[PDB]
Design an enzyme around this catalytic site. Structure first.
Site, PDB file in Angstrom:
ATOM      1  N   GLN A 284     -37.396 -17.109  -9.928  1.00 44.97           N
ATOM      2  CA  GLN A 284     -37.021 -16.434 -11.322  1.00 44.97           C
ATOM      3  C   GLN A 284     -36.485 -17.253 -12.200  1.00 44.97           C
ATOM      4  O   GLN A 284     -36.454 -16.885 -13.308  1.00 44.97           O
ATOM      5  CB  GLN A 284     -36.208 -15.350 -11.051  1.00 44.97           C
ATOM      6  CG  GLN A 284     -34.835 -16.054 -10.067  1.00 44.97           C
ATOM      7  CD  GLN A 284     -33.694 -14.826  -9.649  1.00 44.97           C
ATOM      8  OE1 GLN A 284     -34.017 -14.328  -8.392  1.00 44.97           O
ATOM      9  NE2 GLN A 284     -33.249 -14.026 -10.513  1.00 44.97           N
TER      10      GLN A 284
ATOM     11  N   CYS B 170     -33.968 -10.912 -11.263  1.00 41.97           N
ATOM     12  CA  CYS B 170     -34.301 -10.571  -9.812  1.00 41.97           C
ATOM     13  C   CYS B 170     -34.494  -9.375  -9.486  1.00 41.97           C
ATOM     14  O   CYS B 170     -35.310  -9.008  -8.467  1.00 41.97           O
ATOM     15  CB  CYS B 170     -32.880 -11.038  -9.069  1.00 41.97           C
ATOM     16  SG  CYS B 170     -31.474 -10.112  -9.347  1.00 41.97           S
TER      17      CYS B 170
ATOM     18  N   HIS C 193     -27.203  -9.244  -6.531  1.00 42.72           N
ATOM     19  CA  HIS C 193     -28.612  -9.890  -6.597  1.00 42.72           C
ATOM     20  C   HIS C 193     -29.503  -9.059  -5.896  1.00 42.72           C
ATOM     21  O   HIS C 193     -28.938  -8.637  -4.627  1.00 42.72           O
ATOM     22  CB  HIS C 193     -28.300 -11.599  -5.773  1.00 42.72           C
ATOM     23  CG  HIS C 193     -29.593 -12.306  -6.030  1.00 42.72           C
ATOM     24  ND1 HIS C 193     -30.177 -12.782  -6.964  1.00 42.72           N
ATOM     25  CD2 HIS C 193     -30.138 -13.149  -4.770  1.00 42.72           C
ATOM     26  CE1 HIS C 193     -31.491 -13.427  -6.609  1.00 42.72           C
ATOM     27  NE2 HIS C 193     -31.405 -13.622  -5.270  1.00 42.72           N
TER      28      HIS C 193
ATOM     29  N   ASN D 298     -36.302 -14.347  -0.791  1.00 40.60           N
ATOM     30  CA  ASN D 298     -35.467 -14.649  -2.140  1.00 40.60           C
ATOM     31  C   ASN D 298     -36.408 -15.114  -3.068  1.00 40.60           C
ATOM     32  O   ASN D 298     -37.554 -15.163  -2.908  1.00 40.60           O
ATOM     33  CB  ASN D 298     -34.330 -15.485  -1.753  1.00 40.60           C
ATOM     34  CG  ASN D 298     -33.090 -15.522  -2.655  1.00 40.60           C
ATOM     35  OD1 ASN D 298     -33.306 -14.870  -3.887  1.00 40.60           O
ATOM     36  ND2 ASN D 298     -32.203 -16.527  -2.583  1.00 40.60           N
TER      37      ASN D 298
HETATM   38  C1  LIG Z   1     -30.492 -10.586 -10.836  1.00 41.97           C
HETATM   39  C2  LIG Z   1     -30.298 -12.294 -11.013  1.00 41.97           C
HETATM   40  O1  LIG Z   1     -31.264 -12.809 -11.445  1.00 41.97           O
HETATM   41  O2  LIG Z   1     -28.943 -12.578 -10.788  1.00 41.97           O
HETATM   42  C3  LIG Z   1     -29.937  -9.645 -11.962  1.00 41.97           C
HETATM   43  O3  LIG Z   1     -28.771 -10.591 -12.317  1.00 41.97           O
HETATM   44  C4  LIG Z   1     -29.609  -8.536 -11.641  1.00 41.97           C
HETATM   45  O4  LIG Z   1     -30.424  -7.620 -11.160  1.00 41.97           O
HETATM   46  N1  LIG Z   1     -28.361  -7.962 -11.313  1.00 41.97           N
HETATM   47  C5  LIG Z   1     -27.884  -6.607 -10.836  1.00 41.97           C
HETATM   48  C6  LIG Z   1     -27.067  -6.693  -9.625  1.00 41.97           C
HETATM   49  C7  LIG Z   1     -27.846  -6.142  -8.372  1.00 41.97           C
HETATM   50  C8  LIG Z   1     -29.386  -6.028  -8.538  1.00 41.97           C
HETATM   51  C9  LIG Z   1     -27.316  -4.787  -7.863  1.00 41.97           C
HETATM   52  C10 LIG Z   1     -27.218  -6.143 -12.199  1.00 41.97           C
HETATM   53  O5  LIG Z   1     -25.924  -6.611 -12.017  1.00 41.97           O
HETATM   54  N2  LIG Z   1     -27.605  -4.994 -12.597  1.00 41.97           N
HETATM   55  C11 LIG Z   1     -26.910  -4.420 -13.883  1.00 41.97           C
HETATM   56  C12 LIG Z   1     -27.494  -4.567 -15.130  1.00 41.97           C
HETATM   57  C13 LIG Z   1     -26.939  -5.451 -15.993  1.00 41.97           C
HETATM   58  C14 LIG Z   1     -25.550  -5.313 -16.670  1.00 41.97           C
HETATM   59  N3  LIG Z   1     -25.525  -4.906 -18.042  1.00 41.97           N
HETATM   60  C15 LIG Z   1     -26.039  -4.913 -19.107  1.00 41.97           C
HETATM   61  N4  LIG Z   1     -25.965  -4.342 -20.316  1.00 41.97           N
HETATM   62  N5  LIG Z   1     -26.757  -6.019 -19.237  1.00 41.97           N
END
Ligand SMILES: *[C@@H](C(=O)O)[C@H](O)C(=O)N[C@@H](CC(C)C)C(=O)NCCCCNC(N)=[NH2+]
Length: 212
Positions: free
Chosen positions: A19, A25, A159, A175
């Protein structure tokens, strides 16, 4: 369900992807489950577009993170293009799904695994690859080179990845950090510890696509 599952041996898992710096992710995780269920249902293994979900999932936040469930819901609602049609760019751009021709695949819905239950997740994995989340911020996870990983790690999940198999004492994870990380891009994470969260919070939030 059997003692060992490995969807790679069944030809249902595409090559490991990277990625990059983008927080995409959630889209990679969703795509692995789509690639798997299309192979299971149709007999053909194809790669799908992470970039399309990155651009077009209006519930998610592009490279600032997102939701596997929302991405899977987009594929059930509309569909998804082949990776070749809509290749990965590592930056969120305007949704270009109207200008790429007809969708390549479409699912019927999205189902959540009962959380905080290892057997429920194993049952799901026995049927198809599953989108799961875990805590990857720990250097122990970041530096993993191989073996059955036991941590250290907490359960502050951050993640999204994909579970593509399991054995008596592990769950097998694809991954999205390239083929040079872990076991050629995979990690085997210890199971059977009796922690409800799962090692590294692995049982927190798991989704899979439904395809009739
Ligand atoms: C994955 C990565 O490449 O690190 C990516 O950060 C991700 O999908 N993070 C998720 C966490 C898990 C999948 C639970 C995440 O935090 N999603 C929430 C959305 C982002 C937070 N809010 C805003 N407004 N950007």
């Amino acid at each position: 369900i059997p003692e060992y599952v490995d969807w790679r041996q069944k030809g249902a898992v595409t090559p490991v992807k990277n990625q990059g710096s983008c927080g995409s992710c959630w889209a990679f995780s969703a795509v692995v489950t789509i690639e798997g269920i299309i192979k299971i249902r149709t007999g053909n293994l194809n790669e799908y577009s992470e970039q399309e979900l990155l651009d077009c999932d209006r519930r998610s936040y592009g490279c600032n993170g997102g939701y596997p469930w929302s991405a899977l819901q987009l594929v059930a609602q509309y569909g998804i293009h082949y990776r070749n049609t809509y290749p990965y760019e590592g930056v969120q751009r305007y949704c270009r799904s109207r200008e790429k021709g007809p969708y390549a695949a479409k699912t019927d819905g999205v189902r959540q695994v009962q959380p905080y239950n290892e057997g429920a997740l194993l049952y799901s994995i026995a049927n198809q690859p599953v989108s799961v989340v875990l805590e990857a911020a720990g250097k122990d996870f970041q530096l993993y080179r191989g073996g059955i990983f036991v941590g250290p790690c907490g359960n502050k999940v951050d993640h999204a990845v994909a579970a593509v198999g399991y054995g008596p004492n592990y769950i097998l994870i694809k991954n999205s950090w390239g083929t040079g990380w872990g076991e050629n891009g995979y990690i085997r994470i210890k199971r059977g510890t009796g922690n409800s969260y799962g090692v590294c919070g692995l049982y927190t939030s798991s989704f899979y696509p439904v395809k009739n």
